[PDB]
Design an enzyme around this catalytic site. Structure first.
Site, PDB file in Angstrom:
ATOM      1  CB  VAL A  26      48.474  -7.949  10.989  1.00 30.54           C
ATOM      2  CG1 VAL A  26      48.405  -7.342   9.610  1.00 30.54           C
ATOM      3  CG2 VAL A  26      47.236  -8.765  11.241  1.00 30.54           C
ATOM      4  CG  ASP A 146      32.767  -8.875  16.960  1.00 28.65           C
ATOM      5  OD1 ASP A 146      32.281  -7.791  17.343  1.00 28.65           O
ATOM      6  OD2 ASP A 146      33.870  -9.305  17.362  1.00 28.65           O
ATOM      7  CG  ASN A 151      35.295  -6.546  14.044  1.00 32.59           C
ATOM      8  OD1 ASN A 151      36.437  -6.630  14.487  1.00 32.59           O
ATOM      9  ND2 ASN A 151      34.247  -7.061  14.671  1.00 32.59           N
TER      10      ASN A 151
HETATM   11  C1  LIG Z   1      35.151 -17.340  13.104  1.00 31.28           C
HETATM   12  C2  LIG Z   1      35.296 -16.641  11.768  1.00 31.28           C
HETATM   13  C3  LIG Z   1      35.863 -15.376  11.534  1.00 31.28           C
HETATM   14  N1  LIG Z   1      35.777 -15.167  10.204  1.00 31.28           N
HETATM   15  C4  LIG Z   1      36.229 -14.018   9.506  1.00 31.28           C
HETATM   16  C5  LIG Z   1      37.548 -13.609   9.646  1.00 31.28           C
HETATM   17  C6  LIG Z   1      38.019 -12.500   8.960  1.00 31.28           C
HETATM   18  N2  LIG Z   1      39.383 -12.116   9.169  1.00 31.28           N
HETATM   19  C7  LIG Z   1      39.705 -10.755   9.436  1.00 31.28           C
HETATM   20  O1  LIG Z   1      38.814  -9.931   9.487  1.00 31.28           O
HETATM   21  C8  LIG Z   1      41.114 -10.253   9.741  1.00 31.28           C
HETATM   22  C9  LIG Z   1      41.814 -10.853  10.777  1.00 31.28           C
HETATM   23  C10 LIG Z   1      43.084 -10.412  11.136  1.00 31.28           C
HETATM   24  C11 LIG Z   1      43.651  -9.348  10.445  1.00 31.28           C
HETATM   25  C12 LIG Z   1      42.947  -8.743   9.415  1.00 31.28           C
HETATM   26  C13 LIG Z   1      41.674  -9.167   9.067  1.00 31.28           C
HETATM   27  C14 LIG Z   1      40.949  -8.462   7.930  1.00 31.28           C
HETATM   28  C15 LIG Z   1      43.523  -7.579   8.655  1.00 31.28           C
HETATM   29  C16 LIG Z   1      43.963  -6.652   8.060  1.00 31.28           C
HETATM   30  C17 LIG Z   1      44.516  -5.456   7.331  1.00 31.28           C
HETATM   31  C18 LIG Z   1      44.574  -5.138   5.969  1.00 31.28           C
HETATM   32  N3  LIG Z   1      45.175  -3.929   5.904  1.00 31.28           N
HETATM   33  C19 LIG Z   1      45.468  -3.498   7.175  1.00 31.28           C
HETATM   34  C20 LIG Z   1      46.095  -2.294   7.664  1.00 31.28           C
HETATM   35  C21 LIG Z   1      46.261  -2.142   9.088  1.00 31.28           C
HETATM   36  C22 LIG Z   1      45.777  -3.202   9.895  1.00 31.28           C
HETATM   37  N4  LIG Z   1      45.228  -4.255   9.335  1.00 31.28           N
HETATM   38  N5  LIG Z   1      45.075  -4.395   8.011  1.00 31.28           N
HETATM   39  C23 LIG Z   1      45.875  -3.210  11.401  1.00 31.28           C
HETATM   40  O2  LIG Z   1      46.208  -2.216  12.019  1.00 31.28           O
HETATM   41  N6  LIG Z   1      45.554  -4.444  12.047  1.00 31.28           N
HETATM   42  C24 LIG Z   1      45.588  -4.691  13.449  1.00 31.28           C
HETATM   43  C25 LIG Z   1      46.402  -5.958  13.657  1.00 31.28           C
HETATM   44  C26 LIG Z   1      45.805  -6.957  14.625  1.00 31.28           C
HETATM   45  C27 LIG Z   1      46.525  -8.289  14.623  1.00 31.28           C
HETATM   46  C28 LIG Z   1      45.638  -9.443  14.984  1.00 31.28           C
HETATM   47  C29 LIG Z   1      45.392 -10.357  13.812  1.00 31.28           C
HETATM   48  C30 LIG Z   1      43.943 -10.321  13.376  1.00 31.28           C
HETATM   49  O3  LIG Z   1      43.787 -11.056  12.178  1.00 31.28           O
HETATM   50  C31 LIG Z   1      37.151 -11.794   8.138  1.00 31.28           C
HETATM   51  C32 LIG Z   1      35.830 -12.197   7.991  1.00 31.28           C
HETATM   52  C33 LIG Z   1      34.897 -11.415   7.084  1.00 31.28           C
HETATM   53  F1  LIG Z   1      33.860 -12.192   6.750  1.00 31.28           F
HETATM   54  F2  LIG Z   1      34.465 -10.321   7.726  1.00 31.28           F
HETATM   55  F3  LIG Z   1      35.524 -11.042   5.962  1.00 31.28           F
HETATM   56  C34 LIG Z   1      35.370 -13.319   8.673  1.00 31.28           C
HETATM   57  C35 LIG Z   1      35.198 -16.220   9.646  1.00 31.28           C
HETATM   58  N7  LIG Z   1      34.901 -17.120  10.574  1.00 31.28           N
END
Ligand SMILES: Cc1cn(-c2cc(NC(=O)c3cc4cc(c3C)C#Cc3cnc5ccc(nn35)C(=O)NCCCCCCCO4)cc(C(F)(F)F)c2)cn1
Length: 291
Positions: A26, A146, A151
């Site tokens: 990210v 989850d 999350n």
């Molecule tokens: C099987 C299946 C899953 N889903 C499904 C997937 C999702 N996707 C994510 O939740 C997701 C995924 C992801 C990032 C973000 C998110 C939001 C963000 C972000 C963000 C925005 N501002 C900030 C500030 C700091 C940090 N992060 N952020 C930070 O410190 N971040 C930590 C960085 C980690 C890097 C790894 C990358 C992770 O990748 C949501 C939902 C639902 F439905 F909940 F919305 C459902 C549907 N089907």
């Protein structure tokens, strides 16, 4: 069937990395012409990596544009313009709910948050917002599978929104149980029917919320932290419950137990849990001081 919005790569300017997972990272990025009021604003861009992914990529973005609520993390769109593949999210500057809680457990004072431990009204406010997001998904009849603080994201103004990382499997690898396998189950957040019968429903999410509610009043402390994964499974399948957090009023702990009824349909609806929490949240100080 791309009904999901698209964003030109030229409008996206990566600044630096925010975090990293096994399947993606990210970035904090500047996004031009995305919103009308802001000619330039900050977004969180997730880059992928696989043909399984490029196909998976489309599925989630469809889902993300589909569920848009005031307590679901805003999803602006994707940049399929060449590679790497990007997903553009609203930026939540306080990180995930777990980090935020841990940083404001006892034991600073900032722009959005009072100094020291979060207040009862604040703790209730955080919980109320997560519930509302779960109320929305329940109406849409989706299951999160989850639901944890790791999350949920916190934004400026102490706005809490639900997402589904990540990330979570990586940074919080200790929160999952590896089955061989090769998948991972957040067993400490799952009801008995999910551990035993391998069933995950809406009434499985209220159990998760109680554990989330537990997490909030323990300032981010892992559920059954004193236990191993196998020992955690034992306690959960045998009907043993998480002890009342110190910061949790007896009135609020009653809500947790209502989410923790062993039989799935004897639990309370998420609409019903949200209402009780919001009332407590919006309650006058006088009512909460003697809680
Ligand atoms: C099987 C299946 C899953 N889903 C499904 C997937 C999702 N996707 C994510 O939740 C997701 C995924 C992801 C990032 C973000 C998110 C939001 C963000 C972000 C963000 C925005 N501002 C900030 C500030 C700091 C940090 N992060 N952020 C930070 O410190 N971040 C930590 C960085 C980690 C890097 C790894 C990358 C992770 O990748 C949501 C939902 C639902 F439905 F909940 F919305 C459902 C549907 N089907």
């Amino acid at each position: 069937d791309a009904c999901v919005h698209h964003i030109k790569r030229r409008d996206i300017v990566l600044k630096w990395e925010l975090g990293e997972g096994a399947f993606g990272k990210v970035f904090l990025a500047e996004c031009h012409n995305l919103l009308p009021e802001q000619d330039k604003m900050l977004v969180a861009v997730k880059a992928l990596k696989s043909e399984s992914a490029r196909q998976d990529f489309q599925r989630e973005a469809e889902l993300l544009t589909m569920l848009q609520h005031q307590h679901i993390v805003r999803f602006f769109g994707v940049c399929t313009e060449g590679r790497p593949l990007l997903m553009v999210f609203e930026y939540m500057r306080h990180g995930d709910l777990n980090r935020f809680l841990r940083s404001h457990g006892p034991d600073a004072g900032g722009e959005d948050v009072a100094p020291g431990p979060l207040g009862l009204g604040q703790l209730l406010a955080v919980a109320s917002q997560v519930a509302a997001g779960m109320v929305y998904l329940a109406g849409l009849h989706f299951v999160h599978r989850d639901l944890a603080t790791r999350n949920c994201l916190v934004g400026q103004g102490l706005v809490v929104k639900i997402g589904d990382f990540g990330m979570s499997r990586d940074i919080y690898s200790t929160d999952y149980y590896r089955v061989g396998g090769r998948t991972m189950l957040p067993i400490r957040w799952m009801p008995p029917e999910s551990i035993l019968y391998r069933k995950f429903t809406t009434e499985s999410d209220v159990w998760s919320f109680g554990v989330v509610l537990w997490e909030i009043f323990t300032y981010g402390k892992q559920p059954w932290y004193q236990l191993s994964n196998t020992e955690a499974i034992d306690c959960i399948t045998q009907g043993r419950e998480l002890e009342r957090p110190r910061a949790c009023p007896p009135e609020v702990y009653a809500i947790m137990r209502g989410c923790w009824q062993r039989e799935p349909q004897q639990r309370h609806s998420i609409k019903d849990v949200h209402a009780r929490l919001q009332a407590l949240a919006q309650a006058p100080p006088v009512y909460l001081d003697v809680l």
